[PDB]
Symmetry: C2
Subunit: 377 residues, 2 copies
């Protein structure tokens, strides 16, 4: 019940629970907000397909996925969880069991379980050594589908630490062994413009390999758009028609006004190479790291500079549940890790997640209070 | 293929009379809301999410005159009525419930539940025409443990409100007596508001008092010209509320507080003008369609409720709705053939055509003139 813990924090003093964006608008993003009336009238007079096309083009240009634009088969929905429910309907129709990454944000588990998809965990550590990925998958993936989250939420882990080879090994395994490969790329924006970690064209690999796949992309966790957002799903050619028919039963269209607005955010971030996103996260990440260094919350350095920070509880008795209780009694709301080890929540009582997509002044105040609370125990 | 895919193609066309989504422009007071979008954005950044949920829900159920829903204060918000329907689908599957679903109805209601592997069986709308036959007809025909109605119905505009309170009271009596889950899609209910005889009564008072197990879905997207930046509402009976709450929270944490803030302005604006700016556009186009097609091969089917779609019967010896759709689209006018509204037996829909009325009157009048010109050739 992550969302329910995030519902409570949304009312609270220092909400560091949900990863939704709550930083304010940059100077140039304020120029988008100021033009919302113009963007409204544009969408009212133009064609729906125009705003879909321009959003999809801007998005995959920023993310440097040109193969996705050549194939031109991506479908848009209100949110990544909606795209996930479309994938869930496909998994249920094919009666497939899923091997799902663990840890991962629990709402992925919850939505798939709620559509009665069988779920079996595979630990993130199977991906740490590039030359062991394939034999580890051969041992441990004993279902017809494999569902990854890359970069991962909450750890920031990514196969991109291995260049192309990590993903190539996963795709090799799934092709060789007739596995459907599902990948949630919602955190992939945080790799962009990184000298070593910037995502390559994933769709070139997925298409060239001929693997059966479903790939989900997102805007909501990248930009401060107050959850007025859009997610994207792309399927391999062999299942595209089935998935298309499932998708059209859910919605006809995303708001062309929202799409028009989102396109401006994407273009704005192309212009500043995502600086207004990255700099806010870096300031809060550094503040958390320096504030909590040496405390019972042991910072877990992520592969990718994602919008959440992950900590191990380094104490002989206290759990993450204890830590969450103590911090919330003083008005600071974090998430216990239980909410991420969906197959075995007690494993998550060793970890805590904090959201970084926050105004830095509020975040710094929350960090000062957090260390003061922790220092009493 | 489904009606939504027909609507994707029509959305690329000038005379799109297919999707029921709102495509009329803004009223003068609605252009004021548009001018405040920057302030509505910054307000939602500074305020609490729960504040915008509460203010929206209050405005919505004040306009719809559903005070019981505000007392219970257990309604959950989602991106769209189909998303609320998928939450209902998750509950139906968890409880092994099959659904007796109204026919005709817009096909994605059938399709999305079928795509969730919910077993579905039709019940014809005519079961509800005679108030004193509703209960015995349901006893003889409903052989599932859930019953899913759409009221007012899409595409016919039919409503149990023709019977005052008694039609809904008989449906609820049946479902309570026989331990059935009652699901009701109220997305068209705004079109009853301020009607002297048809204005919806407080449905949640009846649902709560009866003790019936229920899921009730409400919508904004079909009412206001908000370019599908919208919100739907679902309310569950107390005995299933906790299960449904947990299902709902797996789908989304929150609707955009910016969108909620904006929608609240539209709801308040329509309270101030008694939905005049919505009703007048539909009236202008409904009357244009009726006058243009009177005596034509498209026979207007008068609805109980003045909903945002018009329903026509094909009155011709040989031509079907499929033929009419092809003939009109060949000349640039896109309507929906009735086939898919009869989701259990599409051949029954080959005698019907649906036209969307939530359109700019000038475009709609030009579409009607072109439609008449095509039909005048057969
Ligand atoms: N699959 C979906 N949700 N299609 C859009 C739906 O709004 C169309 C509709 O219901 C109508 O045109 O009356
Ligand atoms: N069931 C859903 N969709 N909850 C909201 C989700 O955005 C929260 C989340 O995934 C995170 O905070 O990382």
């Amino acid at each position: 019940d992550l969302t329910q813990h995030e519902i409570q924090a949304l009312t609270m003093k220092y909400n560091l629970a949900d990863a939704h964006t709550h930083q304010r608008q940059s100077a140039s993003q304020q120029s988008i907000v100021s033009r919302l009336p113009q963007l409204w009238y544009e969408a009212e007079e133009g064609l729906q397909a125009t705003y879909e096309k321009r959003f999809t083009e801007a998005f995959f240009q920023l993310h440097r996925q040109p193969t996705a634009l050549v194939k031109n088969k991506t479908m848009l929905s209100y949110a990544a969880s909606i795209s996930t429910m479309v994938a869930g309907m496909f998994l249920k129709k094919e009666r497939l069991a899923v091997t799902l990454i663990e840890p991962c944000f629990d709402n992925l588990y919850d939505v798939l379980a709620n559509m009665d998809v069988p779920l079996y965990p595979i630990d993130e550590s199977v991906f740490y050594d590039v030359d062991r990925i394939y034999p580890e998958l051969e041992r441990r993936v004993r279902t017809d589908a494999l569902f990854l989250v890359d970069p991962n939420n909450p750890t920031g882990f990514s196969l991109l630490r291995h260049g192309r080879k990590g993903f190539e090994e996963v795709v090799r395994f799934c092709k060789d062994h007739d596995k459907l490969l599902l990948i949630d790329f919602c955190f992939a924006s945080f790799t962009l413009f990184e000298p070593e970690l910037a995502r390559f064209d994933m769709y070139e690999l997925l298409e060239n390999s001929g693997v059966r796949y479903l790939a989900i992309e997102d805007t909501g966790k990248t930009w401060p758009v107050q959850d007025a957002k859009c997610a994207l799903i792309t399927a391999s050619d062999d299942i595209w028609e089935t998935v298309y028919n499932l998708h059209t039963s859910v919605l006809l269209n995303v708001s062309p006004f929202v799409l028009n607005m989102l396109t401006q955010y994407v273009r704005d971030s192309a212009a500043d190479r995502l600086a207004s996103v990255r700099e806010v996260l870096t300031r809060n990440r550094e503040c958390a790291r320096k504030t909590l260094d040496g405390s019972i919350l042991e910072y877990q350095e992520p592969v990718v500079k994602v919008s959440v920070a992950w900590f191990r509880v380094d104490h002989p008795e206290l759990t993450a549940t204890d830590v969450h209780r103590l911090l919330s009694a003083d008005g600071v709301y974090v998430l216990p890790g239980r909410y991420f080890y969906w197959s075995e929540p007690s494993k998550g009582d060793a970890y805590v997640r904090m959201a970084l997509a926050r105004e830095p002044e509020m975040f710094a105040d929350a960090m000062a209070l957090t260390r003061q609370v922790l220092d009493r125990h």
